[PDB]
Paper text:
Free fatty acid receptors 1 to 4 (FFA1 to FFA4) are class A G protein–coupled receptors (GPCRs). However, FFA1 and FFA4 are activated by long-chain fatty acids, while FFA2 and FFA3 respond to short-chain fatty acids generated by intestinal microbiota. FFA1, FFA2, and FFA4 are potential drug targets for metabolic and inflammatory conditions. Here, we determined the active structures of FFA1 and FFA4 bound to docosahexaenoic acid, FFA4 bound to the synthetic agonist TUG-891, and butyrate-bound FFA2, each complexed with an engineered heterotrimeric Gq protein (miniGq), by cryo–electron microscopy.
To further examine how FFA4 recognizes different ligands, we also solved a cryo-EM structure of the FFA4-miniGq complex with the most widely used synthetic FFA4 agonist, TUG-891 (34). TUG-891 (3-(4-((4-fluoro-4-methyl-[1,1-biphenyl]-2-yl)methoxy)phenyl)-propanoic acid) binds to FFA4 in a similar L-shape binding pose to DHA, overlapping extensively with the ω-3 chain of DHA and with the ortho-biphenyl moiety of TUG-891 defining the bottom of the binding pocket. This leads to the observation of similar sets of hydrophobic and π-π interactions between the three benzene rings of TUG-891 and FFA4. An additional difference in the binding mode of TUG-891 and DHA is that the linking ether oxygen of TUG-891 forms a hydrogen bond with T1193.33, which is absent in the DHA-bound FFA4. Intriguingly, in the structure, the carboxylate group of the phenyl-propanoic acid of TUG-891 is positioned in proximity to E2045.35 and W198ECL2. The cryo-EM density between E2045.35 and W198ECL2 appears to be continuous, which raises the possibility that a water molecule may be present between these two residues to facilitate extensive polar interactions between the carboxylate group of TUG-891 and E2045.35 and W198ECL2 of FFA4. The MD simulations allowed us to observe water clusters at the extracellular vestibule of the orthosteric binding site of FFA4, which mediate polar interactions between the agonists, E2045.35, D2085.39, W198ECL2, R24N, and R22N. While mutation of E2045.35 to Ala reduced the potency of TUG-891 in each of arrestin-2/3 and Ca2+ mobilization assays, this alteration did not alter the potency of DHA.
Author numbering:
A (entry chain G): 6 to 62
B (entry chain N): 2 to 121, 137 to 248
C (entry chain B): 2 to 343
The structure:
């Protein structure tokens, strides 16, 4: 009878997943905006660098 | 990895001799193979080169049309057929291996050398000093200069540093002027401005004594420097 | 009796976590990033076309120097390209031609491959003999190999089709840790930038975030309606995006423990075979089975540019470490290198 053991281990896993400090989306979505804004100039696909600097010219 | 050569000896002027370089311990068919000579009490001098698969062959201007170099992949042996041997060809001939791909280390292994004794436009690479008395525990910089800038358009500065300990084959230290070869301690360091180059040893050892050679690989023929000797 | 009440307790626990996730969301990624400037069309030109493969390409990985890339194909060949000059540095012949993944070590000395043989073979590129030879064949997986990523030169984490991910010690060949908890075949995994965690997407429409050191899953993410085909971390390591078979991508936030944005369009009904993030995390690219490869704007879910020149299903997709280029591989045996120009 492995069903009881599987149910017990799933219950323990869900227990360990439930007790997690979760932050608010509004305070977590703004971090992605901050990261994308702070690295906009260093991205050579979002803001392409001049053709004299592309190694794949 | 082992490179053993045979065929050297005393040859009358105008005669012929055949040198065979027997490679063992590595994939010989994938390594370009050079021949480098060293006249007695003098510096190194490039002789010939054959690529992997024998596609490309080069010769020095002093030797072009007189020697022929060939390789034999199934037997893992490299040949150098000599004709019209003259008194200026007496030298210690080294068999060198070099594999060329992005990030490789050409000229990394040298054979023990075979002695041949005959009875009786190119980039100029200059080493200012011929002998430097040194003591262990200090720092020494070896200075070399080139007639033409070695920094290519792609960003690679094709200069190599070789150390020839007394009674031993030269050993690759730094390839492309900054990259330290495998098996070489980190005390060696190289830097250059594209025309002027230097090699610095942080802390001398008893095994760092010998002659240091600077070699360019920007284009053929390959030219060595006069050599800087380190003595205790 | 016992199992019935245990499963009722498990369902109540999952309901509790569901309502916690619902409560923790004040808003969505739309209204927070509604007034930001749109990216605009991203014109990307095929600079290099790395021809040479003779069968469908299933995976590729960019080197740490953003110049060398390894590509795996069902030809039975692992090829390392010089993406700057379109040169074949190495062509490793694999023992088994059914290869579904490949990896490039962060140091660059090693590559890995695996597939239907359940074995993750590791090859030593830099050898004194001058050739490339397999150093360690890791065995212990029951299902096919889906993804493998290098922790260090000695640790590699692999995800298999037997619902298990595993951490390996290459010098010994034994699984240091085995990760369990998935119910369906695991198809991809993405190591964190901090390297201390990694997520894994499986065929059960779920993605689990694990801990390489502790050894068991921390968080689980649901939302997809079909198999998860490829996954990738956000560059900061606090988010990841999944590409599923139901023609939608999703951006999950580790700290918020729930999805933030979905990238779907009514024109595309094909599934996302591969996803990748731009160096700034602003452009999420995604290889589709429609032979195309869209370029989604992560913060606004608005399609911006298409890498349409592939003629067959795009199977792999990789953005360089410096973001200079995006290579894409496909079942027509050709990789293409892309980057925008002004």
């Amino acid at each position: 009878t492995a069903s009881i053991a599987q149910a017990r281990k799933l219950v323990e896993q869900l227990k360990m997943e439930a007790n997690i400090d979760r932050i608010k989306v509004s305070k977590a979505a703004a971090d992605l905006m901050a990261y994308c804004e702070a690295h906009a100039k260093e991205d050579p696909l979002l803001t392409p660098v001049p053709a004299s600097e592309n190694p794949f010219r | 990895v082992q490179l053993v050569e045979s065929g050297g000896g005393l040859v009358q002027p105008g005669g012929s001799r055949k040198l065979s370089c027997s490679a063992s311990g590595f994939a010989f068919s994938s390594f370009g193979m050079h021949w480098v000579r060293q006249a007695p009490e003098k510096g190194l001098e490039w002789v010939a080169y054959i690529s992997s698969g024998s596609g490309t062959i080069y010769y020095a201007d002093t030797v072009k049309g007189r020697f022929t170099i060939s390789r034999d992949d199934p037997k893992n042996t490299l040949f150098l057929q000599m004709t019209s041997l003259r008194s200026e060809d007496t030298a210690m001939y080294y068999c060198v291996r070099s594999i060329y791909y992005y990030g490789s280390s050409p000229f990394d292994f040298w054979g023990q050398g075979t002695t041949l004794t005959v009875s009786a436009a190119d980039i100029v690479m200059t080493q200012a000093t011929s002998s430097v008395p040194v003591t262990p525990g200090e720092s020494v910089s070896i200075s070399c200069r080139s007639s033409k800038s070695l920094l290519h358009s792609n960003g690679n500065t094709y200069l190599y540093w070789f150390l020839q300990r007394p009674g031993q084959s030269p050993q690759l230290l730094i390839y492309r002027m900054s990259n330290l070869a495998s098996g070489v301690p980190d005390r060696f360091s190289g830097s250059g401005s594209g025309t002027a180059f230097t090699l610095t040893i942080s802390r001398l050892e008893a095994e760092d004594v010998g002659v240091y050679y600077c070699m360019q690989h920007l284009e053929y023929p390959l030219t060595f420097g006069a050599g800087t000797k380190l003595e205790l | 009796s016992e199992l019935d009440q245990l499963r009722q307790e498990a369902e109540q626990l999952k309901n509790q976590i569901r309502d916690a996730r619902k409560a923790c969301a004040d808003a969505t990624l739309s209204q927070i990033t509604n007034n930001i400037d749109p990216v605009g069309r991203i014109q990307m030109r095929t600079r290099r076309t790395l021809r040479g493969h003779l069968a469908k390409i299933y995976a590729m990985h960019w080197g740490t120097d953003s110049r060398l890339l390894v590509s795996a194909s069902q030809d039975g060949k692992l090829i390392i390209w010089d993406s700057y000059t379109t040169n074949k540095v190495h062509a490793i012949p694999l023992r088994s031609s059914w290869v579904m993944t490949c990896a490039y070590a962060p140091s660059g000395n090693y590559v890995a491959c695996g597939g239907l043989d359940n074995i993750c073979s590791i090859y030593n590129l830099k050898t004194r003999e001058g050739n490339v030879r397999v150093s360690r064949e890791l065995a212990g997986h029951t299902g096919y190999l889906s993804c493998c990523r290098f922790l260090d030169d000695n640790q590699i984490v692999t995800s298999s089709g037997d619902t298990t991910c595993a951490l390996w010690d290459i010098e010994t060949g034994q699984q240091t840790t085995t990760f369990t908890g998935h119910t369906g075949d695991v198809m991809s995994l993405s190591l964190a930038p901090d390297t201390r965690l990694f997520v894994s997407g499986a065929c059960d429409a779920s993605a689990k975030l694990w801990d390489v050191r502790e050894g068991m899953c921390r968080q689980t993410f649901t939302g997809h309606e079909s198999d998860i085909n490829a996954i990738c971390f956000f560059p900061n390591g606090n988010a990841f995006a999944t590409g599923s078979d139901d023609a939608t991508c999703r951006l999950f936030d580790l700290r918020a423990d729930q999805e933030l944005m979905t990238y779907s369009h009514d024109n595309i009904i094909c599934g996302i075979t591969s996803v990748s993030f731009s160096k700034s995390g602003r452009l999420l690219l995604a290889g589709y089975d429609d032979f195309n490869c869209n370029v989604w704007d992560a913060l606004k879910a608005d399609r911006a540019g298409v890498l349409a020149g592939h003629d067959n299903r795009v199977s792999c997709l990789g953005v360089t470490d410096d973001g200079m280029a995006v290579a894409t591989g496909s079942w027509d045996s050709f990789l293409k290198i892309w980057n925008g120009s002004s």
